Amino acid sequence: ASAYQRFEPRAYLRNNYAPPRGDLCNPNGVGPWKLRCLAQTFATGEVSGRTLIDIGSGPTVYQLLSACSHFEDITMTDFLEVNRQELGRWLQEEPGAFNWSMYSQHACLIEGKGECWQDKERQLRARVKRVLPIDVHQPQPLGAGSPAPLPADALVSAFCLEAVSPDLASFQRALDHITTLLRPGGHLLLIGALEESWYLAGEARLTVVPVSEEEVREALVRSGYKVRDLRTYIMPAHLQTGVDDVKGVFFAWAQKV
Amino acid sequence: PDSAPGQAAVASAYQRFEPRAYLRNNYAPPRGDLCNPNGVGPWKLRCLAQTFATGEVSGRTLIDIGSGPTVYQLLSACSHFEDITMTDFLEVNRQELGRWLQEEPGAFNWSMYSQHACLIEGKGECWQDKERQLRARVKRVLPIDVHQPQPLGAGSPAPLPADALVSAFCLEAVSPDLASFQRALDHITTLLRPGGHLLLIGALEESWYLAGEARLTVVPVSEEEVREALVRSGYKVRDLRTYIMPAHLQTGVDDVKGVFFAWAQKVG
Ligand SMILES: Nc1ncnc2c1ncn2[C@@H]1O[C@H](CSCC[C@H](N)C(=O)O)[C@@H](O)[C@H]1O
Ligand SMILES: Nc1ncnc2c1ncn2[C@@H]1O[C@H](CSCC[C@H](N)C(=O)O)[C@@H](O)[C@H]1O
């Protein structure tokens, strides 16, 4: 995990959220696919509550665009200070914030409620109460006296576990860990890379545990979830860019029983 | 009597028209704020979107009558017409359109409207694609004077007669009186083929507006006057709706009391 110390947010954002992976115009892309999964899931209106925690936010907010309308208290987290600062910069509309507006626009497009994207960002920025540091390896990943309401009504995590875990069993424990933050009967929306083993974030070179839909399902089960949905996106050639070796992307809607 | 003088007056007044001012007054907030569904902007795009969505307004060629320096009136229309003709009386307006066509950064930013059309049309489309199509189908920007019996001049370029017409806030804005208005309608109707469709937007009961230094003279009209005029010109009125201008939104840029949207089909 010392590799994460060379991790550059601006390089990561650039690699994954700027064209081509960042062009949202093509519906068959990975960005539109991620957003649709979240939109659809929340649109069921079975995922709901007062509080929600985003595990391993990094420098990104997209994972919460659809979510923000169903939970009034939203908590974001990451391991690195540089990311929290990068989040802050966008939350407070500071100088040099990253432009998520294409993503805001698309979420509004997908949820199809005629909402304008400034209302969407406005609601998100507002509903996010705190940005916290976090380590999923710790059995209490948020420490002892966290400003975060526990247990949360729901959890969201994208591209975290498989990226901070050396192997399957490690990945499994990380899940066990964060699962403890989730109220019984609550919800988890997990996104991650499939059969990925490395990706770059500037000068840093992160090791990833290559997982599969089957491994991922089984791990959610082991952690005590009822899997409600598990969808797979296969990474198209034109989005294989030399920033990683991701083969596909998985999305899971799991419920703590 | 005599039309010439009033028209001359109108023409004279427009020589002070400031596009950037018009744009600031009408298509930047609070009117340009597309976030409130109850605002005039959304209402307009929604009238256009819903109408094209019926699929009853189609063809090869569209002509926008008195485009000014705005494109929003064509956002939902472009996905339905191969060939679009934009027009205006003033060159400074046409230059303004030209700047946006050329995607120069100097140009006005219509992306909020682009996005909103995409939003309400419900096809998942992205605004850059919406805009790229619009820029692609606008085949020309022509001089136009609605008071002339041939508003485009004889032997004009435009493919005539067109399958459809769009016009927004033009006729009433350049007509001194109701008869002038009615005549202007008759004139542009000659550009429209029988069985074709006219989509008309304009201000209700308005007498003036601002375009910078230029404070302009509008013939105030009513829904009925508009309905009657269309019928007079040989249309069947398919839809005619009214937006009442809210307290805020009345900003001193005009004395408009509301807005009309007319969908009319040229009997033939
Ligand atoms: N031990 C740890 N516990 C929790 N998060 C960690 C961690 N070590 C690294 N991370 C964070 O995990 C993130 C994975 S990148 C994921 C970014 C974002 N969620 C997205 O969807 O794009 C990195 O930002 C990294 O800072
Ligand atoms: N005689 C005439 N014939 C046609 N257009 C005229 C005209 N005299 C003035 N105009 C144009 O009528 C326009 C009215 S403002 C309308 C602008 C635009 N259609 C919109 O929706 O906002 C001005 O751009 C002006 O140049």
GROMACS .gro file of N, CA, C and O in nm, chain A residues 24-25 102 104-106 108-109 114-119 122, chain B residues 34-35 112 115-116 118-120 124-129 132:
model
  120
   24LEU      N    1  -1.890   1.087  -2.293
   24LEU     CA    2  -2.015   1.023  -2.254
   24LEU      C    3  -2.114   1.017  -2.369
   24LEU      O    4  -2.219   0.954  -2.358
   25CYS      N    5  -2.078   1.079  -2.481
   25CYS     CA    6  -2.164   1.079  -2.599
   25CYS      C    7  -2.197   0.940  -2.652
   25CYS      O    8  -2.310   0.915  -2.694
  102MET      N    9  -2.021   1.697  -1.738
  102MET     CA   10  -2.064   1.600  -1.838
  102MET      C   11  -2.132   1.480  -1.771
  102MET      O   12  -2.229   1.425  -1.823
  104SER      N   13  -2.273   1.494  -1.459
  104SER     CA   14  -2.397   1.549  -1.403
  104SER      C   15  -2.506   1.554  -1.509
  104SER      O   16  -2.619   1.510  -1.487
  105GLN      N   17  -2.470   1.607  -1.626
  105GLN     CA   18  -2.563   1.614  -1.738
  105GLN      C   19  -2.616   1.477  -1.774
  105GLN      O   20  -2.737   1.461  -1.793
  106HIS      N   21  -2.528   1.377  -1.782
  106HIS     CA   22  -2.576   1.244  -1.820
  106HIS      C   23  -2.664   1.177  -1.717
  106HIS      O   24  -2.761   1.111  -1.752
  108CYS      N   25  -2.865   1.331  -1.524
  108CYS     CA   26  -2.997   1.395  -1.538
  108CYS      C   27  -3.069   1.335  -1.659
  108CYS      O   28  -3.189   1.308  -1.656
  109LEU      N   29  -2.992   1.314  -1.765
  109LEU     CA   30  -3.041   1.254  -1.888
  109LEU      C   31  -3.104   1.117  -1.858
  109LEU      O   32  -3.220   1.094  -1.890
  114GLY      N   33  -3.617   1.545  -1.606
  114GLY     CA   34  -3.607   1.682  -1.654
  114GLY      C   35  -3.526   1.771  -1.564
  114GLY      O   36  -3.526   1.892  -1.583
  115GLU      N   37  -3.456   1.711  -1.467
  115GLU     CA   38  -3.375   1.790  -1.374
  115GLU      C   39  -3.258   1.853  -1.445
  115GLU      O   40  -3.200   1.793  -1.535
  116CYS      N   41  -3.223   1.975  -1.408
  116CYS     CA   42  -3.109   2.038  -1.471
  116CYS      C   43  -2.988   1.995  -1.391
  116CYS      O   44  -3.001   1.959  -1.273
  117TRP      N   45  -2.871   1.999  -1.453
  117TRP     CA   46  -2.753   1.942  -1.391
  117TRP      C   47  -2.696   2.026  -1.278
  117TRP      O   48  -2.626   1.974  -1.192
  118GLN      N   49  -2.726   2.156  -1.278
  118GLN     CA   50  -2.682   2.240  -1.166
  118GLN      C   51  -2.761   2.208  -1.040
  118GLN      O   52  -2.710   2.220  -0.928
  119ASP      N   53  -2.887   2.168  -1.057
  119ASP     CA   54  -2.966   2.130  -0.941
  119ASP      C   55  -2.909   2.000  -0.885
  119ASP      O   56  -2.912   1.974  -0.764
  122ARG      N   57  -2.585   2.078  -0.713
  122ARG     CA   58  -2.624   2.157  -0.597
  122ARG      C   59  -2.666   2.062  -0.485
  122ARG      O   60  -2.621   2.075  -0.371
  291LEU      N   61  -3.247   2.766  -1.730
  291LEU     CA   62  -3.332   2.659  -1.776
  291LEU      C   63  -3.366   2.561  -1.665
  291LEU      O   64  -3.428   2.457  -1.689
  292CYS      N   65  -3.330   2.595  -1.542
  292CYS     CA   66  -3.349   2.502  -1.432
  292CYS      C   67  -3.492   2.498  -1.381
  292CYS      O   68  -3.542   2.393  -1.339
  369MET      N   69  -2.648   2.513  -2.283
  369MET     CA   70  -2.750   2.494  -2.179
  369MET      C   71  -2.884   2.461  -2.243
  369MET      O   72  -2.962   2.380  -2.191
  372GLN      N   73  -2.832   2.114  -2.412
  372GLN     CA   74  -2.849   2.008  -2.312
  372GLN      C   75  -2.995   1.989  -2.279
  372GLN      O   76  -3.042   1.875  -2.271
  373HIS      N   77  -3.067   2.099  -2.263
  373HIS     CA   78  -3.206   2.091  -2.219
  373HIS      C   79  -3.295   2.027  -2.325
  373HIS      O   80  -3.382   1.945  -2.294
  375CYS      N   81  -3.196   1.805  -2.517
  375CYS     CA   82  -3.159   1.663  -2.516
  375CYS      C   83  -3.230   1.595  -2.400
  375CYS      O   84  -3.282   1.483  -2.411
  376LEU      N   85  -3.231   1.667  -2.289
  376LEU     CA   86  -3.301   1.626  -2.170
  376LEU      C   87  -3.449   1.599  -2.195
  376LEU      O   88  -3.499   1.494  -2.158
  377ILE      N   89  -3.519   1.691  -2.261
  377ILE     CA   90  -3.665   1.673  -2.271
  377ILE      C   91  -3.708   1.583  -2.386
  377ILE      O   92  -3.813   1.517  -2.378
  381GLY      N   93  -3.162   1.005  -2.482
  381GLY     CA   94  -3.027   0.989  -2.431
  381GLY      C   95  -2.917   1.067  -2.503
  381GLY      O   96  -2.799   1.051  -2.471
  382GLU      N   97  -2.954   1.153  -2.597
  382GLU     CA   98  -2.854   1.219  -2.682
  382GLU      C   99  -2.769   1.323  -2.607
  382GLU      O  100  -2.814   1.383  -2.510
  383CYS      N  101  -2.646   1.341  -2.651
  383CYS     CA  102  -2.559   1.434  -2.580
  383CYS      C  103  -2.556   1.566  -2.657
  383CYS      O  104  -2.574   1.569  -2.779
  384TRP      N  105  -2.533   1.677  -2.588
  384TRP     CA  106  -2.556   1.804  -2.654
  384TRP      C  107  -2.458   1.831  -2.768
  384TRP      O  108  -2.496   1.891  -2.869
  385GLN      N  109  -2.334   1.786  -2.752
  385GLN     CA  110  -2.236   1.802  -2.858
  385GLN      C  111  -2.282   1.735  -2.986
  385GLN      O  112  -2.251   1.782  -3.096
  386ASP      N  113  -2.356   1.626  -2.973
  386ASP     CA  114  -2.404   1.557  -3.091
  386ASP      C  115  -2.522   1.632  -3.147
  386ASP      O  116  -2.536   1.645  -3.269
  389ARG      N  117  -2.379   1.925  -3.327
  389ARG     CA  118  -2.300   1.891  -3.445
  389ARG      C  119  -2.392   1.866  -3.564
  389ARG      O  120  -2.363   1.905  -3.679
   0.00000   0.00000   0.00000
